[PDB]
Structures are given as C-alpha cells and as structure tokens.
Amino acid sequence: NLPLPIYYTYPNSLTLKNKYGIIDHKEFTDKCAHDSAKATINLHQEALPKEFNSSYLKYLHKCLFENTFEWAGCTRDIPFPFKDGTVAVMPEMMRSNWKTDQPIIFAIGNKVQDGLKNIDRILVEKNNLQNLPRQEFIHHLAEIFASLNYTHPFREGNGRTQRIFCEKLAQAANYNLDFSIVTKERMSEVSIAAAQDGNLEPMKKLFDDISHH
Amino acid sequence: SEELQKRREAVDAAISTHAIEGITLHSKTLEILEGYAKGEYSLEEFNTLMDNATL
C-alpha cells in the first residue's frame, strides 16, 4: 500500500479529507476558520514557551488544526496514516501566483526536515531573537519567515502557523508584531520577492513597519 | 482594562490571520469572538459557544 499525495483529498474531489466530512469548499473554509479562530484565542492566553523551535511550530499547527485535520502537527514529507486505511505523503509541492510566470517550488522531500532544522539553528544561535539590537531582530525574523515560506512543512495551514509562531517569538522578545495592517496583497508581494528574486529587503521593511517594542 | 485589551488583541489577531489569506470569518464566529473581547463570558464559556455554534 504505497503512500501517495492523492490520499490527502477525498476521492473525485479537490477538498482535503477533514474531520467535518465536508466536501463543499465554502462550508469547509467557514468551519476550519471557525476552529482556527477558537484555537487562536486559547493560544494567546497560553504561557510562552522557554524555547522557540520547529517542535513548537508543529505544536502550533496541532493546536490550530487538531479539530480539522487528522494530520494536525504532522509534516507533508512523512507518510501519514489516515483512519480510513490510506497513507498520504506529499514530498513535492508548488504554488502558482496568477500574476507570476513561474510557480514557487517548495522544499522537496526530506529537505522539509532541513528547513525546520535551519530555523532551529538560527533560534539556538540567536537566543530566540532575544537581547538583540532592533536591526538584527528584524533581519533574523525576516530570514526565519522567508525560510518557513520555502519549507512549506505542512500539507495546508502553513501561513496561519508561521504568523502565530512569529507573533509569539516577537512577544517573548518584548515586541508586538501587528499583522492587522498587512493586506493579503502586501504579504504575497514580499513573499514572492524573497522566494523568486532572493530579495529579503521588502520583507524586512514589512517586519520593521509592524514591529512595536 | 489590561485583560480586555489582551482579549481584543487576540480577537483582532484571529481576524487578521484569516483576512491576510482572503478569508472572512462566518458571522456566527465573529459574534462569539466579539462577546469574549467585551468580557461578556469566560474563556471556557467562549469555547462552549464556539463548539455549539450553528454554521
């Protein structure tokens, strides 16, 4: 019984297998966002961890999506056994932007683990981005965010997990990271610049604008 | 109130993370979040209302 990407979705559908049994995309999105909003509120009342790393990132995905996906907290490079007896894996993922010629290719196969370990190395070396001058904090926060964009470790829910991870990382470093002033368009623009052009400056400008000490 | 300000910030963060993906929360989700932000009920009662919500 070979693991395959197809087992993440319902047969003859584009909808991801979920605990709600919802195949309609609109109704699924409503319920998934509802539970993610519940998890967010409980998460912001939870004591901050002593250490920030990829294990904490997986825990946040688990918290945000436990009620939606059987695979909450599990990465797409590792075969995942569903309760239905199928085994899903998705080592190869790409995303197209409607205004860009070429798709963005995410980390392939076990390069997902390398991406997660990359952020762990930065966070150990830079003490969770604590006790740094502002310019260094912004630079490494942008490096971490852009690295997570490439890694895309989960089958779905990457953006939501990455943002709360970064809000909590900032909070432990005595910063308030305000994503409410960031539009879908501005977020996409800075992410494509880092991914395709290898240009981290628009992202660093975004983080500087939304970081309040 | 510091506590209510923290609740309001959590609610605004929950809305933002979906808005930045182009997702508008269901009206029922927003109503339950608003009550919590305003201190009408506890975190436990907020959790009950979310789990019992008709979407």
From TrEMBL, chain A:
It comes from the Bacteria. Residues 52-209 form the Fido domain. This is protein adenylyltransferase. The chain holds residues 19 to 229 of 553 of the full protein.
From TrEMBL, chain B:
This is Antitoxin VbhA domain-containing protein. It comes from Bartonella rochalimae ATCC BAA-1498. The chain holds residues 13 to 67 of 67 of the full protein.
